[PDB]
Amino acid sequence: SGSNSREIAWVHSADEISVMTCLEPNVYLMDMTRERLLAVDSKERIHLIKPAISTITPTHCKINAISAFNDEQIFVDGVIIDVHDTALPQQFEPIDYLKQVSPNILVASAQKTVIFQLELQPNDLMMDVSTKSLQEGQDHGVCHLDANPSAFVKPEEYIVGFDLKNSLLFIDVFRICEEEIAQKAKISYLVADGTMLAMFAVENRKVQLIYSIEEVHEHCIRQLLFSPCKL
Incomplete structure (x- = not known):
C-alpha cells in the first residue's frame, strides 16, 4: 500500500488497485491513513472500517497524530491523552509509545508502566531500549554515539548514531546511517546493508x-518513489 502522490504490486492485500482519495497507508495486517480524515478501503483485509480510529500499527486500531493524541481503540474510540506530540508507536492489549523523549511510556489499550530516565526503539515489554543516552530500562547509560536516532535488539544490541555507526552494545564496527532491523542472522550487524558487514540502490537517505x-x-520500499525489488 502506497499513498497517492493508493497503489499495489500485483496483490490484493492493500487497496483495490486504483483508489484516489494521503500521507501514509496501513497494510501492517483496509489500509489506514490520515488526510492533511481516515480514508481506509477494503481490497483484502477486513473489507469495512471506513473513517474510524494517522500512523497506525498492528491490531492483533490505534492512531498517531502531530498532537498529544495517543488515541487508539477499536472503531469504540479512545483518545488516550498523553498530556506535546504523541510520537512513534510500537505494538508489543499493551502498546508502547515513544514521544519526543527518551523515557517513553507503555499504554495498554491505560498506561501499563511509565518510565523516566534522563534529563526509534525496538521490541525484543520491559526489556526496551531508549534513544534520543542509550539507556535500556527494565538504566544503563551508554553515551557512545555522537546522537541516537534508532536502536535495535539482539537477533549485542546495535544502535545507530545520527552520524552513521550502528555499534555494539550488550567494538564500534562502522561501514545519518542506513537504519536497522533484526534477522535470525542479525541482518549483517543490524544494517539495512553495507553489502554483508562482517561481525547500492538509486540515490540515498533511506528511512525505515x-x-x-x-x-x-x-x-x-527502500527509497522514496523508486526502490529495487531484486532481493
Whole structure:
C-alpha cells in the first residue's frame, strides 16, 4: 500500500488497485491513513472500517497524530491523552509509545508502566531500549554515539548514531546511517546493508526498512518513489 502522490504490486492485500482519495497507508495486517480524515478501503483485509480510529500499527486500531493524541481503540474510540506530540508507536492489549523523549511510556489499550530516565526503539515489554543516552530500562547509560536516532535488539544490541555507526552494545564496527532491523542472522550487524558487514540502490537517505529472510528478499520500499525489488 502506497499513498497517492493508493497503489499495489500485483496483490490484493492493500487497496483495490486504483483508489484516489494521503500521507501514509496501513497494510501492517483496509489500509489506514490520515488526510492533511481516515480514508481506509477494503481490497483484502477486513473489507469495512471506513473513517474510524494517522500512523497506525498492528491490531492483533490505534492512531498517531502531530498532537498529544495517543488515541487508539477499536472503531469504540479512545483518545488516550498523553498530556506535546504523541510520537512513534510500537505494538508489543499493551502498546508502547515513544514521544519526543527518551523515557517513553507503555499504554495498554491505560498506561501499563511509565518510565523516566534522563534529563526509534525496538521490541525484543520491559526489556526496551531508549534513544534520543542509550539507556535500556527494565538504566544503563551508554553515551557512545555522537546522537541516537534508532536502536535495535539482539537477533549485542546495535544502535545507530545520527552520524552513521550502528555499534555494539550488550567494538564500534562502522561501514545519518542506513537504519536497522533484526534477522535470525542479525541482518549483517543490524544494517539495512553495507553489502554483508562482517561481525547500492538509486540515490540515498533511506528511512525505515524490513526484510523477509537473511540477506535476500528485501521488502522493497527502500527509497522514496523508486526502490529495487531484486532481493
